[PDB]
């Protein structure tokens, strides 16, 4: 009974593969290559935020584009002020192992999830835990806010979940992957979130229904970090085979590959620019290559850090890039 | 006219936080974080030093992502059970050759002629992986067990300080 079903799935899978290649009929490099490249990007460090003790594992900007929150492994969540390099809040954490931090788009709530597999929600109007979400069975890798009421989290027991804060229960659960879902990004319309996992697979989920809309499998190892193109039709993924790939949502396949044979170092964070022309990728050989995302050329290299860069964020007004690494320094680049 | 107020507000907002963290940096560096293998964190004191140990009994056995967080630790406690032995050798062989756990020691807990040779055999097999590749294995046996984790991390910190002066 199993073999006949597998053949039906294989025949159905074959229908996907021939259709995808037929639909393609060109590559993104061919059309784009005639346009003028941007040249070399000179980004200079402007701030260096030194308050942490252990390694800074995750940072998240705010939609205010001035305050950012960073969480290190010493059990401290610090809400920096990026303009005048002052600390607004320092929050002690019940668990010192914390792998993500999230800043709400209204700027009222800060959520950090760790290896305690509990997302915690901190109110900002002293500051204290408001609601703690404990439903996952593995660990909690990334989390993001939809609005002040509902938070999407990518756990590490293969399931993304959508949470309601006032109740404490999961309203919807997404169980399509076969590996630890490492990173999620949210669409600008805030209805679709891609998730990257350890299957070399990125999946597209619609947050209202709860089912895998699309699946993008073009990678060869675990997908570390994923980020949408800023219009909502594409996204870039970073993997452990030292490759960044740009996948399109509407064409359902991979447009481009950002890789060199000098790059044998796995990507830890991906982010886009404001327009989307520049693709920033943090690597674990302690620098952050800048890719001309339309033409797959290296515009520049950000080489200011001393240890492995973990998170990389670009502000909503597009003015700055703030990288956070394992030497406990957030450096803000312009 | 409110730029001056903002500077006055922030600078005495920042100063209370920076003086808080320097009274937390002393407690962070006086904390010898540990890892156990084979979610619960328990910190304890033996001879006036703090050992903050994180059991990972609540996680899955796909360990290739959440073990990289534990690179900071002092000593990884390894508990084996006795084909339950050979599959424990392959985990120890994997954390030994990892590119982020290359400098992390390992303490083994394996929990009368016939048994003695068997205990000797496990010690030999594990000692054959340490010689394959900055970090030294510490084997122990059955039958106090928390004093052996104090007395063996003290050897790790003595060897961590000899390297700094390029002695050993």
């Amino acid at each position, epitope marked *: 009974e199993l073999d006949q079903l597998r053949q039906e799935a294989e025949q159905l899978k074959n229908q996907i593969r021939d259709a995808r290649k037929a639909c393609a009929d060109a590559t993104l490099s061919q059309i784009t290559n005639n346009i003028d490249p941007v040249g070399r990007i000179q980004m200079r460090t402007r701030r260096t935020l030194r308050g942490h003790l252990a390694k800074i594992y995750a940072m998240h900007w705010g939609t205010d584009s001035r305050l950012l929150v960073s969480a290190s492994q010493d059990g401290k969540l610090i809400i920096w002020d990026s303009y005048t390099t002052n600390k607004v809040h320092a929050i002690p954490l019940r668990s010192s192992w914390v792998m993500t931090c999230a800043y709400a788009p209204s700027g009222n709530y800060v959520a950090c999830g760790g290896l305690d597999n509990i997302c915690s929600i901190y109110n900002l109007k002293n500051v204290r835990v408001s609601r703690e979400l404990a439903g996952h069975t593995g660990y909690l890798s990334c989390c993001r806010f939809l609005d002040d009421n509902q938070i999407v989290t990518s756990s590490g027991d293969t399931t993304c979940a959508l949470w309601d804060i006032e109740t404490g229960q999961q309203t919807t659960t997404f169980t399509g992957h076969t590996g630890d879902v490492m990173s999620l990004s949210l669409a600008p319309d805030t209805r679709l979130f891609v998730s990257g996992a350890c299957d070399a697979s990125a999946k597209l989920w619609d947050v209202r229904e709860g089912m895998c809309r699309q699946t993008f499998t073009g990678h060869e190892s675990d997908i570390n970090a994923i980020c949408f193109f800023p219009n909502g039709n594409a996204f870039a993924t970073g993997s452990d085979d030292a490759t960044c790939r740009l996948f399109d949502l509407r064409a359902d396949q991979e447009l481009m590959t950002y890789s060199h044979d000098n790059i*044998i170092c796995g990507i830890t964070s991906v982010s886009f620019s404001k327009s989307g022309r520049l693709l920033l990728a943090g690597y674990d050989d302690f620098n952050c290559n800048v890719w001309d995302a339309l033409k797959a050329d290296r515009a520049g290299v950000l080489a200011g850090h001393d240890n492995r860069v973990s998170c990389l964020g670009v502000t909503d007004d597009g003015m700055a890039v703030a990288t956070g690494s394992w030497d406990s320094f957030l450096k803000i680049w312009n | 006219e409110d730029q001056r107020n903002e500077e006055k507000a922030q600078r005495e907002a920042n100063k209370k936080i920076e003086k808080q963290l320097q009274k937390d940096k002393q407690v962070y560096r006086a904390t010898h974080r540990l890892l156990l293998l084979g979610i619960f964190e328990t910190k304890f004191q033996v001879d006036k030093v703090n050992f903050h140990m994180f059991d990972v009994g609540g996680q899955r056995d796909e360990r*290739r992502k959440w073990i990289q967080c534990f690179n900071d630790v002092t000593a990884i406690i390894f508990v084996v059970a006795s084909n339950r032995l050979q599959e424990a050798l392959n985990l120890f062989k994997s954390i030994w050759n990892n590119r982020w756990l290359r400098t992390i020691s390992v303490i083994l807990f394996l929990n009368d002629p016939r048994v003695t040779r068997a205990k000797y055999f496990i010690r030999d097999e594990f000692l054959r992986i340490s010689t394959a590749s900055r970090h030294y294995c510490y084997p122990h046996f059955t039958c106090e067990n928390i004093r052996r984790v104090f007395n063996d991390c003290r050897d790790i910190i003595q060897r961590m300080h000899l390297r700094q002066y390029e002695l050993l």
Partner: nanobody
Amino acid sequence: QVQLQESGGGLVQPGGSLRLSCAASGFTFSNYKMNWVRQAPGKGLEWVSDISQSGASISYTGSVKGRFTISRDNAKNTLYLQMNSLKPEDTAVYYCARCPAPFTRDCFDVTSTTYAYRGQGTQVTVSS
């Protein structure tokens, strides 16, 4: 995109032989480190053997050492496992596993709980 297909198997005499041929597609085979893993009926997953990235460093489990010998060939993009003088006690489902990272030496692929990069399973069976 990693798909691993296997050949071989079938009912064999005690003390016979079998050749399990893992076929690899989707990844660049020269950079990764292959592994074979049993799963006996009633047991969990066990480990069998591996090769390094070049085709040099081979290890085995103590129960199969001297009886089985494995080999990859990177241009043919395949992996092999030749068993010899098989026991009636080692009928199992054999998978072709791959360690998840390029150009490393550490592997975490004995797990049953949803490992992604492993084959379909080949039921080697020994009657008597």
